[PDB]
């Protein structure tokens, strides 16, 4: 757990066991080229390798072989209106690998735009707008500039 004072372990004391952990990992898709066994995560600044291994093998029960983590420093150059730097929150990405030689890819959560239900408080306005656009766009360059309302 983070932001929690750890008890001082004495030579020969009991096992340090945590129940309600305070860690939040994030599965981020790799940006560059990566093999089929290396999976990239994002652990907080207060998390090591064995902690991530135990977290992955205790909850999700994922066989982890090796863990290679590093610190990512956020950008700090964006200026506001009063000429002041904007500090971005930093994070620590991980690069775990499977054990039994299994493969893992990152699916897409998005190609499924087949939705067209009944819309009365949103689709009706767009329908009226497109109907007005279809009924109004009927200019005639042969008129010169006279309005097309007077039937005479």
């Amino acid at each position: 757990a983070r932001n929690v004072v750890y008890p001082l372990y004495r030579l020969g004391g009991p096992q340090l066991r945590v129940f309600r952990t305070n860690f939040f990992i994030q599965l981020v898709r790799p940006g560059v080229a990566q093999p089929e066994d290396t999976v990239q995560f994002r652990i907080p600044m207060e998390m090591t390798r064995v902690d991530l291994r135990n977290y992955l093998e205790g909850i999700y029960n994922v066989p982890v072989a090796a863990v290679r983590t590093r610190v990512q420093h956020g950008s700090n150059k964006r200026r506001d209106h009063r000429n002041v730097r904007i500090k971005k929150p930093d994070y620590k990405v991980a690069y775990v690998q499977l054990a039994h030689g299994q493969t893992f890819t990152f699916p897409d959560l998005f190609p499924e735009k087949d939705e067209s239900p009944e819309g009365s408080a949103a689709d009706d306005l767009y329908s009226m707008l497109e109907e007005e656009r279809q009924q109004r766009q009927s200019s005639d360059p042969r008129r010169g500039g006279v309005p097309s309302w007077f039937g005479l």
């Binding site: 757990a1 929690v4 750890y6 008890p7 372990y9 096992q15 945590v18 129940f19 952990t21 135990n54």
Partner: protein, 124 residues
């Protein structure tokens, strides 16, 4: 001049400063005389994850659940709910003794059991 408003991270000092700073990671061991790390298995936080097989409770509540009044759970309520019935039962018969109270859950000291409350031996 150098920067001042920014905090002191681990990418500012020379070769003699990269190491003793860190990012606040919790140590799980120490070093020896041969540039090695002696990791102790009793210092790494062991995550205790119970079984989630026969557990019928969803993380989201339904809107058909009725609301109720909110009140803090003080120590007096827990006392009157736990120790009061037993005390009343042992006093209504005729065997209560104000000399010994260790049979109701009260502990005179916290150095006897493992999970102490005031010094807090458990992590979280």
């Amino acid at each position: 001049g150098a920067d001042r408003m920014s905090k002191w991270t681990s990418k500012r000092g020379p070769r003699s400063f990269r190491g003793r700073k860190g990012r606040g990671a919790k140590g799980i061991g120490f070093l020896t005389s041969g540039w090695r790390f002696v990791q102790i298995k009793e210092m790494v936080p062991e995550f205790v994850v119970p079984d989630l097989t026969g557990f019928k409770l969803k993380p989201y509540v339904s809107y058909l659940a009725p609301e109720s009044e909110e009140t803090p759970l003080t120590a007096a309520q827990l006392f009157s709910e736990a120790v009061a019935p037993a005390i009343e039962k042992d006093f209504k018969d005729g065997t209560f003794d104000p000399d010994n109270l260790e049979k109701y859950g009260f502990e005179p000291t916290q150095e006897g059991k493992l999970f102490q409350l005031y010094p807090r031996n458990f992590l979280r």
